Amino acid sequence: RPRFCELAPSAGSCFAFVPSYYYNQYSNTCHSFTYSGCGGNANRFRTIDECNRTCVG
């Protein structure tokens, strides 16, 4: 799992509503979460297919 997938998606940076995908190493999977346009960190994905294929080892 690349370390970019374990980051904290800083959605509190600005007021936005863009539902995106989180990566959960603890359960070797991904799960939909809430993101923001501004701010955020790299663990955010647009689909579980990208999230799983790149970090679900």
Do residues 40 and 25 make contact, with C-beta atoms less than 8 angstroms apart? no
Query: In the PDB record, what is the listed experimental method?
Result: NMR
| Cβ neighbours of 9 (radius 10 Å) | 21
Amino acid found at 6: E
**Residue tagged 């690349």 (tokens):** 2
Farthest CA pair distance, the chain: 33
Q: Decide which of 2.40.50.140, 3.40.190.10, 1.10.1060.10, 4.10.410.10 is the CATH code for 1-57.
A: 4.10.410.10
Nearest CA to 44 out of 16, 23, 17, 13 is that of 23
Domain boundaries, the chain: 1-57
